[PDB]
Design an enzyme around this catalytic site. Structure first.
Site, mmCIF file in Angstrom:
data_model
loop_
_atom_site.group_PDB
_atom_site.id
_atom_site.type_symbol
_atom_site.label_atom_id
_atom_site.label_comp_id
_atom_site.label_asym_id
_atom_site.label_seq_id
_atom_site.Cartn_x
_atom_site.Cartn_y
_atom_site.Cartn_z
ATOM 1 C CG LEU A 1 -1.974 -1.122 1.206
ATOM 2 C CD1 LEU A 1 -2.801 -1.106 2.518
ATOM 3 C CD2 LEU A 1 -2.876 -1.135 0.008
ATOM 4 C CG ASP B 1 3.796 13.854 10.146
ATOM 5 O OD1 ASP B 1 3.885 15.060 9.710
ATOM 6 O OD2 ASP B 1 4.079 12.808 9.477
ATOM 7 N N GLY C 1 7.824 4.722 2.716
ATOM 8 C CA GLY C 1 8.523 5.995 2.858
ATOM 9 C C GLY C 1 9.519 6.120 4.000
ATOM 10 N N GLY C 2 9.454 7.302 4.640
ATOM 11 C CA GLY C 2 9.966 7.545 6.015
ATOM 12 C C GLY C 2 9.181 6.691 7.017
HETATM 13 O O1 LIG Z 1 1.489 4.130 9.712
HETATM 14 C C1 LIG Z 1 1.169 4.174 8.515
HETATM 15 N N1 LIG Z 1 1.890 4.869 7.442
HETATM 16 C C2 LIG Z 1 1.396 4.838 6.086
HETATM 17 C C3 LIG Z 1 2.087 5.507 5.037
HETATM 18 C C4 LIG Z 1 1.784 6.847 4.788
HETATM 19 C C5 LIG Z 1 2.437 7.539 3.770
HETATM 20 C C6 LIG Z 1 3.400 6.894 2.997
HETATM 21 C C7 LIG Z 1 3.706 5.557 3.243
HETATM 22 C C8 LIG Z 1 3.051 4.862 4.260
HETATM 23 CL CL1 LIG Z 1 3.452 3.207 4.546
HETATM 24 N N2 LIG Z 1 0.237 4.140 5.864
HETATM 25 C C9 LIG Z 1 -0.441 3.495 6.873
HETATM 26 C C10 LIG Z 1 0.007 3.502 8.199
HETATM 27 O O2 LIG Z 1 -0.841 2.799 9.011
HETATM 28 C C11 LIG Z 1 -1.839 2.335 8.245
HETATM 29 C C12 LIG Z 1 -2.926 1.568 8.588
HETATM 30 C C13 LIG Z 1 -3.818 1.208 7.601
HETATM 31 C C14 LIG Z 1 -3.611 1.608 6.273
HETATM 32 BR BR1 LIG Z 1 -4.882 1.093 4.917
HETATM 33 C C15 LIG Z 1 -2.511 2.373 5.930
HETATM 34 C C16 LIG Z 1 -1.616 2.742 6.924
#
Ligand SMILES: O=c1[nH]c(-c2ccccc2Cl)nc2c1oc1ccc(Br)cc12
Length: 274
Positions: free
Chosen positions: A12, A135, A15-16
């Site tokens: 999904l 954030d 990144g950071g």
């Molecule tokens: O901590 C997260 N970062 C991110 C995130 C945000 C921006 C760029 C990359 C990521 Cl891995 N996504 C999620 C994160 O927790 C989630 C729970 C459910 C779902 Br669907 C998505 C996330």
């Protein structure tokens, strides 16, 4: 234990953050999100309300985890040689506020007021739990398109909340208060209110108001879209140069513009087609 327990779907995002995969708890097919964070890349550690070494993210998540649907729930976590693995809920279908805004442009006030209200409740929840998110921004908000409920995500720059000053920050710069940019110090709450100011501006105009350091330092808000005067008033208030000139969450929520919000269900019905 071990990941014969979940079935790893598509990536999904990354990144950071590390990397987040879609998943399915094999036990009961609950949709889930599998976040992998590499140890080398983790700066902040804490330790459990029992005592063993974890990343702060997991402490924070454990403190905010509860029935409240306004913050992502941590379902479980594992440790591996060079990484931790976090299993989080996953609403389905789902879209992050960034994509939603990229796709639908500036949000109608009615829609931004409901979204914004829900963010306020979420952030207030974190503060009740002693967790400061650090954030807040549209990519860190998820929309459960069916229920019309916003979920706050990604506590990887959070801290325990305290009343003294912070001298460290590793959130998103464009959402960070001017006092951070000049002096490198901020207090938590008032820095959240600033980022909520940016967030609401983002929603109602389709983009963040400031790209550059001198624009933050200056804090003159120009409005590129038609936005009601009350909305502008609340945005400008949140974005007061002096921390203590900013509204408390209670003042935000009692502001004229935040009156008569839609329930989240009605929000989806009206604005999400659900
Ligand atoms: O901590 C997260 N970062 C991110 C995130 C945000 C921006 C760029 C990359 C990521 Cl891995 N996504 C999620 C994160 O927790 C989630 C729970 C459910 C779902 Br669907 C998505 C996330």
């Amino acid at each position: 234990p071990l990941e014969s327990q979940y079935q790893v779907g598509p990536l999904l995002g990354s990144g950071g953050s590390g990397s987040v995969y879609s998943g399915i708890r094999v036990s009961d097919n609950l949709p889930v999100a599998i976040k992998h964070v590499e140890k080398d890349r983790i700066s902040d550690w804490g330790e459990l309300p029992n005592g063993t070494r974890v990343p702060m993210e997991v402490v924070l998540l454990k403190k905010v985890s509860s029935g409240f649907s306004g913050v992502i729930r941590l379902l479980d976590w594992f440790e591996r040689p060079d990484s931790f693995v976090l299993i989080l809920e996953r609403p389905e279908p789902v879209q992050d506020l960034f994509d939603f805004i990229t796709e639908r442009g500036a949000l109608q006030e009615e829609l931004a007021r409901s979204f914004f209200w829900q963010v306020l409740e979420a952030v207030r929840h974190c503060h009740n739990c002693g967790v400061l998110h650090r954030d807040i921004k549209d990519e860190n908000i998820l929309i459960d398109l069916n229920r019309g409920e916003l979920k706050l995500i990604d506590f990887g720059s959070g801290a325990l909340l305290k009343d003294t000053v912070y001298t460290d920050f590793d959130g998103t710069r464009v959402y960070s208060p001017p006092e951070w940019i000049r002096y490198h110090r901020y207090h938590g709450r008032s820095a959240a209110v600033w980022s909520l100011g940016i967030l609401l501006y983002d929603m109602v105009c389709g983009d963040i108001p400031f790209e550059h350091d001198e624009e933050i330092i200056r804090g003159q808000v120009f409005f590129r879209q038609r936005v009601s005067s009350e909305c502008q008033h609340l945005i400008r208030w949140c974005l007061a140069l002096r921390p203590s000139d900013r509204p408390t969450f209670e003042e935000i929520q009692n502001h004229p513009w935040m009156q008569d919000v839609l329930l989240p269900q009605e929000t989806a019905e009206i604005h999400l087609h659900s």
